[PDB]
Structure 1
C-alpha cells in the first residue's frame, strides 16, 4: 500500500550496553538480539515489505576481540541453521541472501549461508538480506574495481559509467530495491558506521534509543508509523 516501504534496513546496536545494564554477559546480549530477528522478519513479511535487510557485521567489527567475533559467527550459523530454515520453509516463503565479503567468514558460516540461500532460491515471498562483513565504503570500492576491470577488458568505456551502471556492480545488485526507503538504527547513535552509503541518498532515517535486545515487532511498527508521517520531496 504505497505508504509501505519496499526496502527496510536495520542497524543493530546497543548489545553490550544492554548486557551491562542487566548484569549479564555481552554474549548473552548478542544472543538475545539475534533471537529477535525472526519475529522482525515475520512482521516485515506480514506488512508487505518487499525487502528487509539486517546488518550484522561490519569490517570494522573484526577489530573486536577474537572471542567476541567468534561467538557472533557461531550465533549467526545457528540463526541460519534454525530460524532461517523455518522462515524460508514456512508459508511466508522468504527468500534469503547474504551480502558482504563472505570470504572473510569462517567456512562453516559460509556453508550455512550457502545452505539457506539454496533452500530459498525458488521462494517468492519477501526477500531477507543478512549483511555480514559488509561495509559501504568497501562496496563502493569493489564496484569501482569491477567496473575498472571491464574498462581494462574493453567491455565498457569510461563515459559509459553512469549511476545505473555503478549500481549494477554493488553488492545490492541482487535486489531491484537496493536503496532502502527506511533505515532504522537502534540504541540511540546517529551515524551510519560504514553501512550503506551509495544506497542512502533519499532514505528516511529513524533513530530509536531502544537497545537492540529490547527491540521487537512494536519497534518496527513504530518506525513504519514515523515513515508514513514523513513527507519525501526528493530535491524537487
Structure 2
C-alpha cells in the first residue's frame, strides 16, 4: 500500500534493564539486542518499507564506561561482518549506509562500515541506515557549518537558505526519505534523547514498554498497525 511508511526509524533501549532482570551481563543484553536486528531488517524489507534506520550509538553514549563502549563497537563490527554481509548479498538486496561522526569510531569499525557500504553500493532493495555516533543537534550544527563555509566562499548567499537547502547538508542527505514516517522507541521512555530533530516535524511516534532484547518482528508489525490506524 501507501499506508506503508517509506521511512521507519528505531531507537533501541532497555538492554541493561533487561540484563538486570534476566540476571545476566549487560554485554549479553547488548548482544541479544543486536541479534534481533537482522530479522527486523528482513521483515521491514518484506513489508516494502523503503528505509529502515536503527540508532545504535549517540555522542552522549561515549560517556558510558570505556569497557561498555568497546564491547558495543566490537558487537557492531561483528554485525556488519556476518549479518549485514548476508543481508546485502541475499535476495533482499539491501543497501547499507552508516550515518554519524564516523571519525569518532575505531578504525576497525570504520572499515567494517566501508566494506558493507562498498559491498551493497549498487543494490536496489530496501535502504538500511545504521546511525552510529549520530546526534540530532550535531547534525544540525554540522549542516549549519557546511552552509556557512559555502556562504563564506560566495557559493551561497544567506537568503538562499531554505529548508530544502538545509536538508541537503544534513547527514540524512543520502536518502530521499530523510524524515521518518514512523519512529519507534523501545523500553518505555518518551523522549528523543538527541536522535533526529530536524527530521521529525510530522513523524508518528510509537512507544512500547518492550525492552529491546525482547523486540522482534511482531513488535515491528505492531508499530506498523498503530501507524495504519493514525
Decide: shared fold, TM above 0.5: yes
Match of 2:218 in 1: 218
User: C-alpha offsets along residues 189-235 of structure 1, whole Å, 9 cap, x if unaligned?
Assistant: 00000000000000000000000000000000000000000xxxxxx
**Distance of 2:201 and 2:158 partners within structure 1:** 23
Deviation at 1:184, TM superposition (A): 0.1
SS in 1 for 2:224: helix
Deviation at 1:27, TM superposition (A): 0.2
Deviation at 1:179, TM superposition (A): 0.0
Deviation at 1:87, TM superposition (A): 0.1
User: C-alpha offsets along residues 79-111 of structure 1, whole Å, 9 cap, x if unaligned?
Assistant: 000000000000000000000000000000000
Aligned ranges 1:41-190 → 2 under 5 Å: 41-190=41-190
**Distance of 1:46 and 1:166 partners within structure 2:** 32
**Distance of 2:114 and 2:157 partners within structure 1:** 35
Deviation at 1:132, TM superposition (A): 0.1
SS in 2 for 1:156: coil
- Cα RMSD (Å): 1.0
Deviation at 1:56, TM superposition (A): 0.3
Runs in 1 of length 4+ with deviation above 4 angstroms? none
**Distance of 2:92 and 2:220 partners within structure 1:** 18
User: C-alpha offsets along residues 12-41 of structure 1, whole Å, 9 cap, x if unaligned?
Assistant: 000000000000000000000000000000
User: C-alpha offsets along residues 33-70 of structure 1, whole Å, 9 cap, x if unaligned?
Assistant: 00000000000000000000000000000000000000
Deviation at 1:120, TM superposition (A): 0.2
**Distance of 2:108 and 2:72 partners within structure 1:** 13
Q: Please report the TM-score for the alignment, with normalisation by the length of structure 2.
A: 1.00
Deviation at 1:164, TM superposition (A): 0.1
